[PDB]
Curated annotation (Swiss-Prot), chains A, B:
A single GO cellular-component term on record: cytoplasm
Organism expressing this protein natively: Yersinia pestis (strain Pestoides F)
Cofactor(s) annotated in UniProt: pyridoxal 5'-phosphate
Location(s) in or outside the cell: Cytoplasm
Protein name: Glutamate-1-semialdehyde 2,1-aminomutase
Main EC class the enzyme belongs to: isomerase
Family: Belongs to the class-III pyridoxal-phosphate-dependent aminotransferase family. HemL subfamily.
EC number(s) from the headed UniProt entry: 5.4.3.8
Catalytic activity of the protein: (S)-4-amino-5-oxopentanoate = 5-aminolevulinate
Length: 406, 406
């Protein structure tokens, strides 16, 4: 019995399932979860001292890798001034200025405590601004059969459409022409694994919102600062009414933000009638400020994309050599692995058709090789700027050995 | 124009109303909000360098005062290991053990990212465990006419009762005998200012839940570790089915937790069918662990209560000398000021009958005296263990001078 196994047994007595986050229970992959002592650059170190090349990046915040010195220095300096104040600070203003500089579509912005609060606040704003009740969301897309604990009437004003399918979106609008307040969309799906949009998809959503008087909300909690500096909306050339941000903007600590067109944001109280939640923590905003300053430097996204592209190329080549059907999706610093015979993976149905038991065996074989992947078939992979060409070639060599055993 | 006034003008261009949290806009009191540079012990220091005796305590987290060395040391040490991991840690287990040791009614516990997530998760668990849809909540009580942005059917399964009125609770149960999943109650109301329960009230809620098969959820996000070490539930001798915690458990950074009876908590996934949100951040849990270790030492609550009682006594005496009708409510390290002719303040209607314009003038006069009070008539005051007898006598002397000017 390892230190992780002992901590898991201990945890099970006081925490249901031994974990606070059900995905961290390894339910997706099976077995006992890995407890982590520390992290540095491209690596995770478990409680038994084993090192792993990390492709989880704490679920997307660690763009610069773990424990980046500029972020660590900014937080140690901020901590001397106190953790929180319950009153506004100069960092709130500086952070709002930096975020609106980096993401130009945002004229105004509000910082919140998490990505979930940002999406919920953006949805509430769209409903208040338009005076309409219905929202369009996509299947396999999480923003923050029937599950126990929630009353049936809770999902009454939510219209679920098919990701990358403009016809299903038009159909929902044609059913409710004057009732859709907004479309909320992940510009690159990340919660059904990594699914980039079809070229027609995001401009098609912008044109439908314009036609039917709805607001377009682009949820960049995961894609923000990962796909591109100015977001996946910049990369795919689409201008939304509102943007949601999280993760990277906190530099490793929870932070959220939502922003958009000046006249939409002006509808928020005290300026307007829409009321929203907790403000951004000062330590988390100091971490995020330092992170955003570092990634806005020349050549950062070029390097991130080159690292991710080299991993995707190597994995495809390794799978082919070992006769393992595999699709790799990737954009900027984001990627997704799919064990399927399909030529492309562009929708939720394609993800559902992947070989989940094969992914589970691959995941455990990769842990043995010292590679830590997201422990789910329905989660995207993340590249960091601390990963070296050597880390990538080691990962590709490890995947080839794992593919030979499937 | 001060540095706070300049930051506020700057903030208004990019942030609706110049603040992230509408209460921090000083809407309750009027005027331009104070921007805070730093905090230490019992004091806040604004961006112009002015010192204030603080009674906001960052909205309750700062039980040990601001920037406590044990908390600062624990976070600087934890930050070296990385900010977040997206995987379980030993601190999750240690923190769960410490919280269940301090609050004995909790057999099992789950850590979440905020107090709001804890109350929402506890409400979802009660609904899932009982299979019922309705919840009872109290007016003036916030857990996380009609406001724009939320559809009308959203509050369909919520029954609002009157705080400190057992008859209104019985009436709601008699209307829906087999449909109430739970009662969620702040054991000391803090979001309509400070309203302690009547002696009959919390035991009466326990007896009604038992009669009608509902779960009793005690929301201790604010009262936890403030009223007493084992919570206001220990102080008022009531045993709930579930407890919600926040604030102090994060040592100044956002953290939430919900816990309760072993068989109720076992209904959570993967062990049971109820699914919930983000896990506790490691830096925030290191801050909370150090905070909870410090306040569980002998004599802490005795000192906290003595400080709060001496402030309440001094304020009452000062108001009487100056012919200003005032009610002071207080329990453990929590207090509330009420400008009213009423003999007692025990309900929402009493709070509504207070002189709000008098509170607004008092608040601004106290800021001039170097005392920072919650900038709302509907918010409780907080005592810290860093406040000295001299701080308290200075506050009482300042309040007497302010009462003479009302
Ligand atoms: Na490329
Ligand atoms: Na007393």
């Amino acid at each position: 019995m390892s230190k992780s196994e002992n901590l898991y047994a201990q945890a099970q007595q006081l925490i249901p399932g031994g974990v606070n986050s059900p995905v961290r229970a390894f339910t997706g992959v099976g077995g006992i979860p890995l407890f982590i002592e520390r992290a540095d650059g491209a690596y995770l170190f478990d409680v038994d001292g084993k090192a792993y090349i990390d492709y989880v990046g704490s679920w997307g915040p660690m763009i610069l890798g773990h424990n980046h010195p500029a972020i660590r220095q900014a937080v140690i300096e901020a901590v001397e001034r106190g953790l929180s104040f319950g009153a506004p600070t100069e960092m709130e203003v500086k952070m709002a200025q930096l975020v609106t500089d980096l993401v130009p579509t945002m004229d105004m912005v509000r910082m919140v405590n998490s990505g979930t609060e940002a999406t919920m606040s953006a949805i509430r704003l769209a409903r208040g601004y338009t005076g309409r009740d219905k929202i369009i969301k996509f299947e396999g897309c999480y923003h923050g059969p029937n599950s126990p604990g929630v009353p049936t009437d809770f999902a009454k004003h939510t219209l679920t459409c098919t990701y990358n399918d403009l016809a299903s979106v038009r159909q929902a609008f044609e059913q409710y022409p004057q009732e859709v307040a907004c479309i909320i969309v992940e510009p690159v799906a990340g919660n059904m694994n990594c699914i980039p949009p079809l070229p027609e998809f995001l401009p098609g959503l912008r044109a439908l919102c314009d036609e039917f008087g709805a607001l377009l909300i682009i949820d960049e909690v995961m894609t923000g600062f990962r796909v591109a500096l100015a977001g996946a909306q910049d990369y795919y050339h689409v201008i939304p009414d509102l943007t949601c941000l999280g993760k990277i903007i906190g530099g490793g600590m929870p932070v959220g933000a939502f922003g958009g067109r000046r006249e939409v944001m002006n509808a928020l109280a005290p300026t307007g009638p829409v009321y929203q939640t907790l403000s951004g923590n000062p330590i988390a905003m100091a971490a995020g400020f330092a992170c955003l300053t570092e990634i806005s430097q020349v050549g950062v996204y070029e390097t991130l994309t080159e690292l991710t592209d080299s991993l995707a190329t190597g994995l495809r080549h390794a799978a082919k050599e070992e006769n393992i059907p595999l699709v790799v999706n990737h954009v900027g610093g984001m990627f997704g692995l799919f064990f399927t015979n399909a030529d492309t993976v562009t929708c939720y149905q394609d993800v559902m058709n992947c070989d989940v038991e094969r992914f589970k065996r691959f995941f455990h074989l990769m842990l043995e090789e010292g590679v830590y992947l997201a422990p789910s078939a329905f989660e995207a992979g993340f590249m960091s700027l601390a990963h070296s060409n050597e880390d990538i070639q080691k990962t590709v060599n490890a995947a080839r050995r794992c593919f030979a055993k499937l």
